[PDB]
Ligand binder design. Structure first.
Ligand SMILES: CC1=C(CC(=O)O)c2cc(F)ccc2/C1=C\c1ccc(C(C)C)cc1
Ligand SMILES: CC1=C(CC(=O)O)c2cc(F)ccc2/C1=C\c1ccc(C(C)C)cc1
Ligand SMILES: CC1=C(CC(=O)O)c2cc(F)ccc2/C1=C\c1ccc(C(C)C)cc1
Ligand SMILES: CC1=C(CC(=O)O)c2cc(F)ccc2/C1=C\c1ccc(C(C)C)cc1
Ligand SMILES: CC1=C(CC(=O)O)c2cc(F)ccc2/C1=C\c1ccc(C(C)C)cc1
Ligand SMILES: CC1=C(CC(=O)O)c2cc(F)ccc2/C1=C\c1ccc(C(C)C)cc1
Lengths: 198, 213, 198, 213
């Protein structure tokens, strides 16, 4: 019964996300209504950034949080090979080519979280302010840890546009469901069809 | 006839914890009832099992929308999901699916109520959707198209008998399927089902988490 | 300049559409605002219904109004083969198998036109009324021309759902543009690039 | 900068009747303005012609949005098209593209106004969008990424010099590109450009024919 395992895995993944956001300086100081808005609008891009960076070691595939490998062949077989190739070329391979470390990933995700354009925010300017403090911190990090790379800071920020559009395509083409859910749903339905019935 | 409209009506009437799992359970529970309904449809179980899976994956969205749309005739300005939850227009706009919510009331619930669509007619329309010969991967689309023909053969017969003064009632019923098709597509992209039965469990889980240690 | 010829052809095709709608009984009697709304909401499905029926004679392709033949090999090459095949299997081929005549097409297109679900109608019930008069007329036609096919009438109406979904996928995936505009736009832009510099 | 002179980028920035064909001609002319601008961008013409076409097809949508968004800094509740026509919020709502219109004002025009984005800074951001190394089919994506690197190197130098009191202005400029990317995708599926410059010519053409004999 893989379905039950994946729903439980997601709840752990969701738990980790909120805990991660609480450790971000000043996030909890925002109005609780604003905290929920930011997680509602950002969880999609925050996950894509995570397993993209986690998949630097992988070749032609993405490594999900459950240790599950997914190769681009399994993706094309599921009819979502176009989006899958965008993850590899625009995120995974670019993250690998520049050797984006875990501090730079965390900063980019905090920037994504502090999205002042999110609809319904009670204090967008405070969100914008926390955004500024994050990337001002990221710039300092890049200057001192990579002094020879004067453009690393902008290079990092200029991967957020590719993350924005990829996040939208995943929601539109049901990328998450069709990567793992195509076959288990056939198995899941067959079980119900053979069950006892009156 | 060969597709007894009585057998179609009998099938219609015979049907804190981690929040994502709670949503999976509700979705699993609602899918199973849809399978038990489809197996009470005449001749459906006689199809190849692989084709039964195809027809379900292809129609599960529209079949559920048809269910709670006709179920919401009694309630007003809201939809009654199978879980007993009474979801209203404001509860859906907060979840970001306000546009779809109004289309369900305007194009399905309200039109169902005006013409007083009985549960026998509902069952036929859902059987027609179930027997969709356009579903991709069908081993023999012709026998699916044949079964569909038997359903709307019986439905027309049922309509001309139960409502003789309304000769065009039969066509009127079929002409709600385009709207049901369009609405079905919007529910997937907006995660309509996920959000309605899960918007509050998620907000509840979040609110508790953001205040927890 | 093939691009310019397409815009002329569109003006003609649009003119033909408005005249067609004015010949429909009682259409012009509707409020002019409602006439525009119904043409705003229906032109997409009305065009798809036309060239799908126009393509009955074609094999593995669709015939556009400008006589331009498009084969599926060119559509799949343009990255829209999925939608293209849906036109063929769900519309063109089905029109062929049942030998849908031009009278049945006109009735179906008029039913699509009189769409009571169109947003902003002044009198939705009046449009629904004209809709009832059309398909009641279509039923009589089917009974006389194909009495041995008692379900022909419903069979026709049950292509409208497929036409609805195919109409939505064409707009979101820009099926019209990508069908032909892959090569002309390259030439169109290349012509702009080889213009004088400075 | 030495390799990507920020001065050349600012120079480039400053440098009835048939309704469909009327729109095509207007779109044709507006597209050509974008091409002439792109050719005056240093090193773009040095690229293979096939790559130049790829970058134009890939960025034309966002490049136009960035253009008329900055030009609408002065006006309020509307956008100022290149033709001088003042389109208002409700005029876009009439076309059914009211949600996109508000996003342009809130996420682009308003933000551009608050930070007093000058035309030099705009030109650089558009040059960054132009040099998109993610565009599919490029013969040498590396040189495109190099050209993009030169641009935002110059912009950062320009920003640290022209606004020394705003150390975070450079990142503030780049962090509008995600919104520009998101909004650009929504304009395509809604036919945003077609409608604004064509909404009225169609109603004019429709109204006159529905009244005509
Ligand atoms: C993309 C994705 C990741 C990757 C990550 O976040 O590292 C993950 C990790 C988890 F632990 C659980 C689920 C997921 C997941 C998608 C998903 C897929 C199907 C479902 C339902 C429909 C069962 C729910 C979610
Ligand atoms: C449907 C949905 C909403 C509601 C909305 O966004 O309209 C939401 C809001 C949040 F704040 C967080 C998650 C979600 C969410 C689904 C979800 C998706 C993946 C996961 C795991 C894999 C981390 C867990 C949950
Ligand atoms: C058949 C099917 C599709 C494909 C489609 O209809 O286009 C889909 C797309 C989605 F995004 C989510 C679910 C589904 C789905 C069935 C399903 C139903 C219950 C569940 C729960 C029990 C975990 C999981 C999956
Ligand atoms: C599908 C289609 C037909 C077929 C028909 O309607 O029978 C047609 C006939 C005409 F005369 C003109 C255009 C079209 C057309 C699509 C189209 C394609 C590109 C464009 C712009 C982007 C230039 C605009 C429209
Ligand atoms: C964008 C657009 C609208 C407005 C909308 O749909 O929001 C509209 C409303 C109408 F009544 C008629 C045409 C159109 C139209 C474009 C169009 C232009 C040429 C053609 C030819 C090829 C038949 C077909 C369609
Ligand atoms: C490059 C390009 C794309 C591809 C994309 O951006 O994804 C597109 C998509 C559309 F839907 C419409 C137009 C276009 C387009 C250019 C174009 C520009 C002027 C014209 C008029 C003058 C006939 C016709 C076409």
């Amino acid at each position: 019964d893989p379905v039950t395992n994946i729903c439980q895995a997601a709840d752990k993944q969701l738990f980790t996300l909120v805990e991660w956001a609480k450790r971000i300086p000043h996030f909890s100081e925002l109005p609780l209504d604003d905290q929920v808005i930011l997680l509602r609008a950002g969880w999609n891009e925050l996950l894509i950034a995570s397993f993209s960076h986690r998949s630097i070691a992988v070749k032609d595939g993405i490594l999900l949080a459950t240790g599950l490998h997914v190769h681009r062949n399994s993706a094309h077989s599921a009819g979502v090979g176009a989006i899958f190739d965008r993850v590899l070329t625009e995120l995974v391979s670019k993250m690998r080519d520049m050797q984006m470390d875990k501090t730079e990933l965390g900063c980019l995700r905090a920037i994504v979280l502090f999205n002042p354009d999110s609809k319904g925010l009670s204090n967008p300017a405070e969100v914008e302010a926390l955004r500024e403090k994050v990337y001002a911190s990221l710039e300092a990090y890049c200057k001192h840890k990579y002094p020879e790379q004067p453009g690393r800071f902008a290079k990092l920020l200029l991967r957020l546009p590719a993350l924005r559009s990829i996040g939208l395509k995943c929601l539109e083409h049901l990328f998450f469901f069709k990567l793992i859910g195509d076959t288990p749903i056939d198995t899941f339905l067959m079980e119900m069809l053979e069950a006892p019935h009156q």
